Symmetry: D3
Subunit: 182 residues, 6 copies
Amino acid sequence: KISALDLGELSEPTKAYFAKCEEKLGLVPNVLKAYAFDDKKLRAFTDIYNDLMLGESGLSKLDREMIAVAVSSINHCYYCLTAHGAAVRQLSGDPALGEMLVMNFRAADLSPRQTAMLEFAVKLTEEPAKIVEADRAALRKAGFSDRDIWDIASTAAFFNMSNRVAAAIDMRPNDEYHAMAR
Amino acid sequence: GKISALDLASGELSEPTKAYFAKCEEKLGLVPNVLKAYAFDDKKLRAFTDIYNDLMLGESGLSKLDREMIAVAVSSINHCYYCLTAHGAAVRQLSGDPALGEMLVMNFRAADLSPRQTAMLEFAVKLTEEPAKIVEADRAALRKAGFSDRDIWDIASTAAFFNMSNRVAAAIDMRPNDEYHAMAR
Amino acid sequence: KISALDGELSEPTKAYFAKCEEKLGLVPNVLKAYAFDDKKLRAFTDIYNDLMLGESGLSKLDREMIAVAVSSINHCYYCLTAHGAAVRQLSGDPALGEMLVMNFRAADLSPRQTAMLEFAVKLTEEPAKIVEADRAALRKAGFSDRDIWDIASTAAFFNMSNRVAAAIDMRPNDEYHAMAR
Amino acid sequence: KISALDGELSEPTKAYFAKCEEKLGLVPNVLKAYAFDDKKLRAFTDIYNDLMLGESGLSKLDREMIAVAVSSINHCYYCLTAHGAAVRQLSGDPALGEMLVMNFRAADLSPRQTAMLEFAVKLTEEPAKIVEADRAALRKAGFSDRDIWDIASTAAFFNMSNRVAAAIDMRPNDEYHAMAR
Amino acid sequence: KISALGELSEPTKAYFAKCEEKLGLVPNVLKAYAFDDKKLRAFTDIYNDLMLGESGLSKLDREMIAVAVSSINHCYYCLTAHGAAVRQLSGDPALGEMLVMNFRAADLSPRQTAMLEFAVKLTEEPAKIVEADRAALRKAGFSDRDIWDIASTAAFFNMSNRVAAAIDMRPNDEYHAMAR
Amino acid sequence: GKISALDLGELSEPTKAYFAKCEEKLGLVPNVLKAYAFDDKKLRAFTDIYNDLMLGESGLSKLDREMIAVAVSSINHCYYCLTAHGAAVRQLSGDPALGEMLVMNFRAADLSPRQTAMLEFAVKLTEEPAKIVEADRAALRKAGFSDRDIWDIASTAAFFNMSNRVAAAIDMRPNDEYHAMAR
């Protein structure tokens, strides 16, 4: 079961893409399978995911994965802590960093720059109503540009969406994730 | 004047974006400020409009008004000025009922909603406040209200998207168009 | 229906409503809810009028702003409608009403206004946790101790109003929605 | 000090305090805090006496119990002290005062008293979420619509009292601590 | 009914004889563990060492932490029992009341304030403790061992509150009238 | 390679002997035992309570109890305990995935009705212990737990509410060995 919801054969272009996934990764990420009932939806998801997590940014790819895990920790999202926790381990080379981010980032002995980024993602996840100029000013003082700030917010905001889709439908992450990068 | 509290530079709009905005303006009589926020990268703008349109306007077992109701209920919980303004105006427009618009912004429990609409909005509230605690009984209750698994998917997506949207606007102090306020009163 | 709960009005109350209808273009629905007991109606109108229209270091708009911000946290349909109308009216600024109903942090308020609303928010959300630095912060913003009293009382009062309205499902007048847009 | 906030009492206020002293053994400090404006003092005592002492399908103990349960959620030192002593005095059971102050769920109340308190808790913690089902639970426990009003009103009022007290750090009289032990 | 969930051993009978003579009652919490003498011993040892052992915190400091924590958690048993201890140790019936109710009304020193504010945050939001929180305790006049002792006292009452809560453990009637 | 953020020395010979028995049985000395080793009386009292509760006779299996520990630790975001007891769930279940699920969100795990009722009670005792009523015990009994089970469930949940708070307060650090174990 990739989820608790019941939704056709895959379209030719999704089979093409999934082939690519299986060639590059060992596997087709289950989130893509969840979306595959509707190619418009699949394509719009992959378009945003890739721009946000892989696009050009002052944040590294690992920065963004660390934001994704921090937010997914607060929300207790099993799919995302699994998939993106594997990504932190893999991108960092540090199996322990992935566990700490999954459990409590305050445990991690992060740099000031990384702390500031994650503390903002925390407030944005927990109490969006309360974000004020002082919260932006804290990121600037940490050395982030305003476009960096856009990218931190966008990433944190995105995972607030991803967590809730996954929770809503009980989406299951690939079993291969668990053993990777340990 | 500023559409957000970030201090962004920007170059010219691409000719495709100028055209696209010419049509927003021709149609809606405004270019929604969120679109202007994403115009620094046509890549992002296209991503945004694709997801928004499929979500809010594509085929669904949810009417367009149901989805604007989910948008506003979620935005009410998170106290999102951008979204309450913009989707509040959409609810008043689509229903033809300015008071309904106001109830959803303030407290949807004050509106005389069908059991179906209540079940939908109560799921959205739980997904907004405590996504860790969603269980099969939550989905079971939507099914008792008549929703298909594809509908549950659309409710969850709509509610999810607004949790993202509210956070992007909150994080950067995004400013809704002044014109929304007076519409459909 | 003015509420979810179930004879004739008194002559004093029938005449009180004649006047409201003259001065305002309507009888506020809260007055009709209390109308089953004139003792209770008089008590309410006495506290309401002293708090909102009486003497204070706060302007009447300052107090309507506090009312809306508290009602916003509590999601009170009656009070957001009624006092939102009042902010639109007193300020001449339809957008300001909406900001206060939705999120006051979007509004471009003075430091004094901001200080006043942040206190009303803490008193609404965690009154257990008020400490002397909450009072010290009002003083820095320039509030006397009597202004602090008035802010506290205005905020406390809509914590009661929000809860009566919510309990009984009290309905605001339709005309409020169209007003001052 | 009776609060953390900074002339003479009026003649009628001095006479009223002399009478309190005789009838109660003390002048309630809340009355002293209001004594800077007799209008406000009056408004306070009118609403208080009507709510707490006026005719209702709720006993006087029922209403003090609501008061203390609200104050306990809000951690109001003034009200837990003053109304806790009221519960102890009216019930003649010091243990019951304690339970209500600490956690009413330990008390072993009737199904009626538990229905009433569960509604006051919800109204206190999440007024945004009150629905018809909540009023329907009161009816099923035997309350008339007018009791529902009185229950709501009592709980609403103490959400205002708790906040005025907390905002200004209002201090209860020392004598309450030893009362009815 | 000490709770909402028989024969005592001879030692446990002896031990209850000394509490009786020393305290004027047998704390109900002891009666609730006395179905197993080794769980009773385990409890008494940890309890005694915690509240009565050598520490840079006073016995009263520790009893105040117990009450502030119990107040946040609304624990009838521990508010009653440790409220009594605070009244008795301090000599001040009002102080016990203030901590049961709201310690911010209490007029404590900056050192006592820092202590209870840390115990509060640990009770409410243990996920968010940080070095700045420990640096604020040092600033208020606490050692590293005093931080361990505060944390352990606060942590223990977070367990006690939850066992009492879970089984509806009832405090002794006699606590209520004491040191008033 | 610090066991905590506090200024915490020279172990007694009995304590060193016990730690060798730890290496022999566990492959490591739990850092929690090192934290307590400044005083053997405290170390002794901790080991006594811990072992009775986690290993002593009980209607709950050892795994049942490690699951209550991880579920509580998950709510409180306790890095020490999620690490140490996450590893114990993986080791006792032989199912790496189950350890992850309980650390992340137990509602994802394919638990029996009975197991779910247990964790649901652990959750409420963790989040809102003021609100525990007879109806919460009744639901455990409907799930088929005895009252001695209810007590053990409550004691286990309670205990980790303390353990998490001591760990968080002093920044106690779990052994790096835990992270690779039973994967």
